[PDB]
Each structure stands twice: as structure tokens, then as C-alpha cells.
Amino acid sequence: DENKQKALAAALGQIEKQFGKGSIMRLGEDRSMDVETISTGSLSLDIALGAGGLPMGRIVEIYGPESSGKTTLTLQVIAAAQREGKTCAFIDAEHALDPIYARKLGVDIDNLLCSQPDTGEQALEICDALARSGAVDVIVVDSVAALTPKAEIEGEIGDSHMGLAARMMSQAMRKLAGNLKQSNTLLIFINQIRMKIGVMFGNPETTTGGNALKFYASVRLDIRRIGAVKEGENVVGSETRVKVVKNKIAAPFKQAEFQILYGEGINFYGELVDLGVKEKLIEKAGAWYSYKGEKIGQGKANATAWLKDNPETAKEIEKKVRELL
Amino acid sequence: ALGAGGLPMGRIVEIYGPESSGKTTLTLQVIAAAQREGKTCAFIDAEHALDPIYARKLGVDIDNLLCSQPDTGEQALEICDALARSGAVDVIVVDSVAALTPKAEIEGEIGDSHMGLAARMMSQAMRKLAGNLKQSNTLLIFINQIRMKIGVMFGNPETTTGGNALKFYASVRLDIRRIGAVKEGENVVGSETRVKVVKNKIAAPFKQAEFQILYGEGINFYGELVDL
Amino acid sequence: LEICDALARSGAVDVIVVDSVAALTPKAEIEGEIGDSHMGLAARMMSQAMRKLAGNLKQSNTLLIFINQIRMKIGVMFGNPETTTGGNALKFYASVRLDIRRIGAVKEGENVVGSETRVKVVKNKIAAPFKQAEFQILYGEGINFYGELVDL
Amino acid sequence: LEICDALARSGAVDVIVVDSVAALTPKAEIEGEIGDSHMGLAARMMSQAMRKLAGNLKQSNTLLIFINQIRMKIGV
Amino acid sequence: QQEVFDLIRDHISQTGMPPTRAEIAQRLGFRSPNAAEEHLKALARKGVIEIVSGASRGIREEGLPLVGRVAAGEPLLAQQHIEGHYQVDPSLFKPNADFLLRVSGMSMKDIGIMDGDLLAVHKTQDVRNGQVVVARIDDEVTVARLKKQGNKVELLPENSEFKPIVVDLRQQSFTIEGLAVGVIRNG
Amino acid sequence: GLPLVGRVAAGEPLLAQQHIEGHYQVDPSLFKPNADFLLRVSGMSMKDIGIMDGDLLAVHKTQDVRNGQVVVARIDDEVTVARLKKQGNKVELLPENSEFKPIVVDLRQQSFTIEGLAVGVIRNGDW
Numbered sequence A: 001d002e003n004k005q006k007a008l009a010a011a012l013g014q015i016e017k018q019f020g021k022g023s024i025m026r027l028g029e030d031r032s033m034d035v036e037t038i039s040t041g042s043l044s045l046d047i048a049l050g051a052g053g054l055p056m057g058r059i060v061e062i063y064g065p066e067s068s069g070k071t072t073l074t075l076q077v078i079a080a081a082q083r084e085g086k087t088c089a090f091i092d093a094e095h096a097l098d099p100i101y102a103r104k105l106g107v108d109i110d111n112l113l114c115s116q117p118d119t120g121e122q123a124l125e126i127c128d129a130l131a132r133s134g135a136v137d138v139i140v141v142d143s144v145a146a147l148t149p150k151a152e153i154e155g156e157i158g159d160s161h162m163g164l165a166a167r168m169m170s171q172a173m174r175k176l177a178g179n180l181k182q183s184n185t186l187l188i189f190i191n192q193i194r195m196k197i198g199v200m201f202g203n204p205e206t207t208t209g210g211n212a213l214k215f216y217a218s219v220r221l222d223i224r225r226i227g228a229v230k231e232g233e234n235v236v237g238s239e240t241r242v243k244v245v246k247n248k249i250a251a252p253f254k255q256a257e258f259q260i261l262y263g264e265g266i267n268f269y270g271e272l273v274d275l276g277v278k279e280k281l282i283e284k285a286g287a288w289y290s291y292k293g294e295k296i297g298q299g300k301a302n303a304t305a306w307l308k309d310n311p312e313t314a315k316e317i318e319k320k321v322r323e324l325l
Numbered sequence B: 001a002l003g004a005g006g007l008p009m010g011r012i013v014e015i016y017g018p019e020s021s022g023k024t025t026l027t028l029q030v031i032a033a034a035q036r037e038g039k040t041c042a043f044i045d046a047e048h049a050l051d052p053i054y055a056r057k058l059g060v061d062i063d064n065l066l067c068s069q070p071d072t073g074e075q076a077l078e079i080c081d082a083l084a085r086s087g088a089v090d091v092i093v094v095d096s097v098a099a100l101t102p103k104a105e106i107e108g109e110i111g112d113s114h115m116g117l118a119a120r121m122m123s124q125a126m127r128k129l130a131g132n133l134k135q136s137n138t139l140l141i142f143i144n145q146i147r148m149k150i151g152v153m154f155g156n157p158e159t160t161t162g163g164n165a166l167k168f169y170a171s172v173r174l175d176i177r178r179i180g181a182v183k184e185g186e187n188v189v190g191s192e193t194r195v196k197v198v199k200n201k202i203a204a205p206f207k208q209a210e211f212q213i214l215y216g217e218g219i220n221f222y223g224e225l226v227d228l
Numbered sequence C: 001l002e003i004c005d006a007l008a009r010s011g012a013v014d015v016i017v018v019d020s021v022a023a024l025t026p027k028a029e030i031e032g033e034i035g036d037s038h039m040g041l042a043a044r045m046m047s048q049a050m051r052k053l054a055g056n057l058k059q060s061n062t063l064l065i066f067i068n069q070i071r072m073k074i075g076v077m078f079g080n081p082e083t084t085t086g087g088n089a090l091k092f093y094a095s096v097r098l099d100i101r102r103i104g105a106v107k108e109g110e111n112v113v114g115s116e117t118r119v120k121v122v123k124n125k126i127a128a129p130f131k132q133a134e135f136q137i138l139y140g141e142g143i144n145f146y147g148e149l150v151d152l
Numbered sequence D: 001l002e003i004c005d006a007l008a009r010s011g012a013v014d015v016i017v018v019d020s021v022a023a024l025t026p027k028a029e030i031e032g033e034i035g036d037s038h039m040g041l042a043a044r045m046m047s048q049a050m051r052k053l054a055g056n057l058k059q060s061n062t063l064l065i066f067i068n069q070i071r072m073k074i075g076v
Numbered sequence E: 001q002q003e004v005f006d007l008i009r010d011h012i013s014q015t016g017m018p019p020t021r022a023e024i025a026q027r028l029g030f031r032s033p034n035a036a037e038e039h040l041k042a043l044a045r046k047g048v049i050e051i052v053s054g055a056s057r058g059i060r061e062e063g064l065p066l067v068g069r070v071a072a073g074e075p076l077l078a079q080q081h082i083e084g085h086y087q088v089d090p091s092l093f094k095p096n097a098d099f100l101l102r103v104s105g106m107s108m109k110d111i112g113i114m115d116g117d118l119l120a121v122h123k124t125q126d127v128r129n130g131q132v133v134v135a136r137i138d139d140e141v142t143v144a145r146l147k148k149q150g151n152k153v154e155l156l157p158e159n160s161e162f163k164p165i166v167v168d169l170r171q172q173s174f175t176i177e178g179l180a181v182g183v184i185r186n187g
Numbered sequence F: 001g002l003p004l005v006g007r008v009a010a011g012e013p014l015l016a017q018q019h020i021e022g023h024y025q026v027d028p029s030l031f032k033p034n035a036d037f038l039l040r041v042s043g044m045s046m047k048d049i050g051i052m053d054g055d056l057l058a059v060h061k062t063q064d065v066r067n068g069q070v071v072v073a074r075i076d077d078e079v080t081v082a083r084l085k086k087q088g089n090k091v092e093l094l095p096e097n098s099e100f101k102p103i104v105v106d107l108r109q110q111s112f113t114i115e116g117l118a119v120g121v122i123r124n125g126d127w
């Protein structure tokens, strides 16, 4: 009935007048809802996340035990962001970042912003300021276990201070989300594990700093160490696994695996070997691997070296793997 | 389970629970079901986290759905007031009560205490929305989040957000949980659910329902048919 | 409140129930926006209504029952933090005040069939105050009289 | 830990050493009796302590060395 | 402590008021109110005492709590959620029961547990071959009879239609959650 | 607590004093119709439905019964647990096991007697 349509148009117009153009519109016409992603620095994890990376404008959480590889993963993410021209920022609340190693991983330290907040409040305030600034594209927070309320710093060891950090996190997310979506900024939180007392059933692990972040997060990643990597009697890397334990973009509960080699970072070409084997582009022959008939080498390390020394074949392999998966 | 066959018209509802439990999927399925009968539906996304393509997979007419992403709680509630007095919209969804934020809080710093403001704003909202919703015959659904209550020695420590008005004004209240996984071989393709009725003004309360949610599809209808 | 007044003045209505003193709203709030401050408007309105209705109610012999709601007093150090909406006027005029509270459940196997309810008399001017009462409300039946009789 | 923080804030001490962490008894455990349950209290204290010391140490440029003991995990 | 609770129970009746924390501490034989405060808090956390604004609100039990599910067949998700209680004596069961679990599947039919039943568990981590136990294998729970040898553990069925489940400790994590002690059925 | 019925001799009700094993405080409201008392059984004859030797079977006492229900009854003044199927003037008590066979004794010679339904099962035996 047209008497309904006239009322509908009148109401929409009045809303738009009071609150401005673009306050309300058909969901099939709003191009700002479309999702956009940036690379995570490993092909396997980008496959695990269905859309091909981390979404812009959302919130992301990463946690694991100690020496898992969180900081190196986030530095590798920053690195790939900057090579496309974007601006980044780092907040080292634990007071432990190392410029030289961050350079070796590939970050450009002459343009990366940094900050070592005295308290958690100013950490979150700096994050809000940067988001409103509209000129920073990636932000990462070193640890939510280092974000002290101002009362704790001025108090004494042993005071209760019960539940303050949870209130801080709740207020922070509640205020930030809109600014981060307007400015098209990606924010990553790192978190440590603790253990619950008194739980009688289930996994007794937990993460620090209240429980609003898990509601407001869009992707949650879990990173753990599973083995050593050796060239002789001396270790040179670590085996890793990643679980996508939450997802608002594609289907959750997938896994990724890769190596982290000290001084270098994530080993990209090992992923090409593994995925070429999976997609039948690389012919496995027992301990020997062959590509299009030719024997490239024996063992994973040898095959990776062969690929490193023969760029064109690695190129075509990477493009085909991208096309299939 | 609901007793009367579904959610009533011209009244307020509240669906809450833990995270990754199925609130958004359920509400989008309600919207999609209503649009096959010719009604007009709207979505207020305060958390800035809706995904349009996935809303098309479940069935929503994305081209005929009104979406608004407000800045503050007051504006978000005033848009609902305008729609309720329009007389043309038949379903409204507010993504979360937690995301609503008084304007005075947006201006302040992150340590500022705005003690008690959100609850008062909500208690005004209900007072103003109750009459118009009935006059216009509009269903309004609130979604909520769970927080723990400190200082409870014994008993249940959970609690929802936003004060106490919504409990008194809500005609139905649904609690939704995830209880298991659904697998094809070694893969995971869905999640088992249990929905409990905790307040009900149109039939007896404290009933239940169990179904499946399959990623990329809606609720599993034929499994419910088999079990029934 | 004008409907209440007119029915009281008609002389032919013997019980009037108002379903929530919280859901009563002044016009200023109705025509305003969400977020404004209309402090004390409802309280003043209710006080006026009370002092206007007191005489008519007795003149025509009608019983007027208000239902209310709970809210929390904020930042209270010691005492009870619960409160009722609508100002302090209604507490003075009331001839009896009742608090009803649910305290348990009625079960048959795995099925909940009803509720167990405490009730208290926190103010009374027809007899002594502070007596309790207890009974069951079973869906579809209301108060269970015969259980009360079996107990008494 | 209070003494540690007090010397860290001063900016005049370059090295602090804590002889053992297995001996840092909480106050509530000191005033109680043997056999009382004090589930997970020293751990909470230690988390608070690290949270409060991490910044003062780097600002003042001091090195803090913790010595620790070994125990067994039952039922592994 | 029980003695502390008794001290309030009789002191309040004898004098009409609860004793002060200093009085309780002095009776306990230590020079600190913390001695009384710790016990008062422990009783309060037990659900026996109420506290408001640092003072006792009063001196004012539901049985075994049903906590989660468990799978007789393939492993099932582990997630604690205390949905309700049941009023039944711990003393009934051989080692004292601690909580209840809901059973799905039919892989223990012969012994006498079946779909939809409640299983009483006694919390512990010391168990030996041949007992009925509950195990978690990478955040999923199962109930079966144990047979441990070397680096592999066998979780056997008690129904000829089901085959045993075997886990290698070098690939998956294995934690024993308790020991089964009985069953309650109400369906 | 609720009384427990152990071994039962003929000529007296199940709840006779010498039949009382003791008191176990189990809330009677847990079961669909209120449980009145408990009764130990040697349940080799009802295995397939999950009843075993040594377990306890809760009973809500009543003489009313319908078809298809599991009932505690007496034949020859002897206690037994079995399901009921009625032909008319004749009625048979049936097992739920793979090796047992029906009971159709003649009422004119020996009549069946009901004491209550079976509402639920509780056990504490060795595993």
C-alpha cells in the first residue's frame, strides 16, 4: 500500500535530517560494510582464515603460552603491511621489544611508531587518539597483562584492587569499536594464559584481563610450540601451530602449521613445499621430491633450498597454489 | 517450546548468553522468516560487526533490509523510536545492549567513572518504547552479553548488562548455549545448541529446545523433524 | 490518573488496579528526546494525584491498588539499596503495603509446575504490621487455596 | 617486594638479587596455622608484583635476579 | 572453622550479639584480627555466613552439582556449566561423590550405564589399570575402562558393538578427570 | 530418610519392620510420581533395560497400573520386578532379558498383586 510507503519515506527522511546523511540505508547499498583483509605473513594461516587475511576495521586477539611466537608473528604482520605503503604503530607495555631483531624480521624501524606506557589508561588513550587521527592503519598492543590501573601503581603490594582491569577493558572496547570502524584501523591484542583455581571439570586455562574482549573480538588465534628444528646438534627454529578458535568472517576451527627460524622469521618456502605436495604439484618419491619429473632434492630442507635457488618454478608453484586453495 | 508458537507481536524480547553461542544467527533467521510473509525488517548494529554476504547466505533480502550503525546509545534508541512511530517496520534488532554508550562517556577519558548512567538511559528507553510498540504492532528484540557479579559468595554469579528495567519490561527472555560440535569425519561443520525459556508471559516458562546450526546454512530443520 | 479520578467520582466502581507506577510517564517525557533530564516531574505529578484522590476514594468507597517495581539506590554505604519508583508521596498515603518475593520452585520429576512465594506486610494501619504469609502459585490455577488449608 | 620497588624507584641501585622465591611467604600464611589452605595466593602476589615492577625497572635501568627452586608435579 | 562457627552460634544466643573480630582472634590465641577474619570469610564462602560493608549480615547444601556431559562413544566436548543440583547423599557412594555428569551413547551397556543417565564421579588423579575412569583427550571427554602400558593408553568399551579407542601420548594430551562411583536414573 | 526394603518374607507387606534395611535420605521429589520407598533387587532378569544385581529400584506405591509399565508385584506371595501385559481375564508378567521366559500363572490358582510402579534406579555396587 502506498500509504505505507509515504510514511516509510517520511520517517527515513526525518532520521537522515536529524542525524545526517548516511545514518540509515539499505544493506545491499552500503559499500562500507564490505570486508577487506591484509596478509598474515604465512600462506597456511591465510588459508585457515577463509577470506585470506585479517579484516580491516575489526578487533583481533592472539594468545598462547610463553615462547610461542606472538611478538614475531605480529612483527611479521606489520612488515607485510608496510611494504604496501601503510603506517603502523607498536605499544610495548611489557618494556621488552628489541629494535635490532625487529629489523632483522623485516620491519622498517625508521618509520614505525612506538610507545612504552607508564600505565594502562594512557595506553588505551593513545590507542583512541591514534584511531581518531585517521592516519595510522595498524596498531598492536604488547600485553593486556601489563595494563595496570592507576590505582595499582600508586597502591601497595598486597592490596585487593578487585576487578578494576575488567572494567577498564569493558569501557575501552565500548568506546573504541566505533572509532576503529570509522577510521578503518586494525588493532591486535596479545594475551597470556593463567590457571583457574577450583574448577573441577574442563580445561583449567584462562586469559587475563576480564572477558569483554572475547565478545568484542572478531578473530581469536591460539599459538603454541610443538617441536624443535635442527641442522646439526644445535637448534635453529621452532615448530608452530595456530588454531582459529573464533571467526566472524569464515568458518572457524581450522589449523595451520609452519616453522619459525631464528634471525629470519617465518619460513615461507617450506609452506610452498607442503602445499605443492598436497595439491600434487610436487611429486613425492619416498624420501625424494620431484617437480615435473626432475628430482629437486631429498628431504624438506633440501627441497626448500632447491626452490630458493630456482625462482621461476617457486613462482609458478605459488600462483597455482593460490589459484587452487 | 515457547507455548504460543513463536515470539509475540508488539512486545519486547531479550536473547542473551555466552559468546559464539548463536544470537546473531537466530535473529537473522527470524528476520529472514518474516520477510517471506511480506513484512519490513530493520537492524541496528551497535557493535559494528555485521557481515552482509553471510546474511545473504542465510536468506535475508539484503536489498530490502534497513541497516544503521549508530555512534551513541541515545541516537541508537531514538532511531528505534522513529521507526516504531512510523507504522511501517515490523521487526527491529539491536545488536547489543553492551555496545550502547551514553554520549557523556564518549567524550571523557577511559578512567572516568560515569557511575549508573547506562541503566538510567535504558529505563527511560523502555518507558518511552512500551506504548508506541503496542500502538504500532511492532516486535523489538534486544540482544545482551554476560558479565560476572563480584562479591556473590554462593549461588549463581552471572548477570546481563544494562540494569534491571529490561527484565521487568521483557515479555520473553531466551538463554542460548553451545553444548557440542557437529562433525563430518574429522572436520567440524556446526554446533549443537540448547535454548531455555526463562521468562514468559504467553505460556508456562522453563522449557527447552535443541537443534543444530550448520555454517553456511540456517538451523537444521529436517533434523528437528526427525527428532520430533 | 484522570480515568482513575473519573471512575472514583462515578460511584459505581469498587476496585481499580493500576498495573505499574513505573510505566506512568509525564507528557514532557513523551514529546522529548531520549537523553533529556526531566527530574522530579513524575514525583510531583504523583503527589498531586494522591492528595486529589484521597478524598474521593473515601467518599465513594473504592479500593485503588498500585503495582510498582524495584530499583537500586546508588552509592549507598549502609542500609538497604532497594527502592520503589515514583517518589515518596505514595508511602505516606498507603493504608497497607505489601512485598511479594519468590523463594523456591515446585517440581514433578524434571518439570517445573509452579512457584513458592514469600509475602510480607511492611506497613499496616488496620492491624499490627510485620506478619508473613507463604503459599504456592501454580500455573493455570493461581494461588493454591487447598494446600494452604491443609497446612493451617 | 616493597623494598625491591622502593630501591628501583630511587634510581641509585644498579643490581638487586632475591635469594629465593620459594621463601616469599604471604602475610596471611604467616599469621595462620599449619594445615590451612592458602590456594594460589603467592602466585597472585607474584603476578601483581611483576605487573608493578616491570616499568620502574626499565625506567631506572636496573637488573633484578630471581632465584628459584624445584618441585615435582604429581600424577603426570 | 567449625569451632569458630559454633562460637558465633552460642555467643550470639548468650549475649544477643555476635562477637567482634578482635574477641574471636583473642579467643583463638593470636594477636591479630586477621585470624578471625580468615575463618569468617571461609565460612561465608561456604555459604554459611553473609557479609555486608565489612560486617556480618547474618549467620543464615543443595547436594551434588550436575556439571557437564560425557560420552560413552567417541569423545565429547568438555565444558563446565553448572546447570542444576540434585539432593542426594555423598555417603551413598563408595568413595565420596563430588559431582554428576550426563551420559550420551551406549558403549558401556553391559556394566549398566546408558543414554541420559547421571554418573557420580569422585575427583582424583591416582588410578590404575582395570578401573572405570574419565579421561580428557585434547579438550574432549570419554568414560571407559583403563589399560595403560608404555606410551599408549587403551580406552576399552563394554559393548561388543563398539571397538576400543587408542591414544598415543606423544601426539595428544591426556588428563584423568576422576573416578566413577555410581549412577542415578530418572528418565 | 526414606525406608529401604531388603529381603522380604511371605505373609507381610514389603515395608514390614523386619524387611526394613535402614533409612537413606533421598529426596522423594526427584522422580516423576513421588517415590515412596526403595527396594533392593537381583536384576539379572531386566538387564536389557539397565537393571542389575544389587541395585536399588525406586517405587511409587499404588495399585493402579496400565499396559506396558514396569511394576513391582507378587506371585505366590513372592516379590518380583517385571513388565505387565494384560490379555483380559488373564495377565502376564514379562522379562526384559535374553534368557528368561514369561509368567502367566493362573489367578484362580494364584493371583497377581501390585504394590507400586518403578520410577527410577539407583545403585552403589562395585564396578
Ligand SMILES: Nc1ncnc2c1ncn2[C@@H]1O[C@H](COP(=O)(O)OP(=O)(O)OP(O)(O)=S)[C@@H](O)[C@H]1O
Pocket: A065, A066, A067, A068, A069, A070, A071, A072, A073, A096, A098, A101, A238, A260, A262, A263
Ligand atoms: N632477538 C632474538 N634473537 C634470536 N632469537 C630470538 C630473539 N628473540 C626471540 N627469539 C627466539 O625465537 C622465538 C620467538 O618467540 P617470541 O617472539 O619471543 O614470542 P613470545 O613468546 O611472545 O616472547 P616472550 O615475551 O618472551 S613470551 C623464540 O624461540 C625466541 O627464543
Ligand SMILES: Nc1ncnc2c1ncn2[C@@H]1O[C@H](COP(=O)(O)OP(=O)(O)OP(O)(O)=S)[C@@H](O)[C@H]1O
Pocket: A215, A216, A246, A247, A248, A249, A250, A251, A252, B018, B019, B020, B021, B022, B023, B024, B025, B026, B051, B054, B191, B213, B215, B216
Ligand atoms: N561468516 C561466517 N561464516 C561461517 N561461519 C560463521 C560466520 N559467522 C559466524 N559464523 C559461525 O556461526 C556460529 C555462531 O555465530 P554468531 O551467530 O555470530 O554467534 P554470536 O554469539 O551471536 O556473536 P558473538 O560476537 O560471538 S557474541 C559461530 O560458530 C560462528 O563461527
Ligand SMILES: [Mg+2]
Pocket: A070, A071, A072
Ligand atoms: Mg612477546
Ligand SMILES: [Mg+2]
Pocket: B023, B024
Ligand atoms: Mg553477534
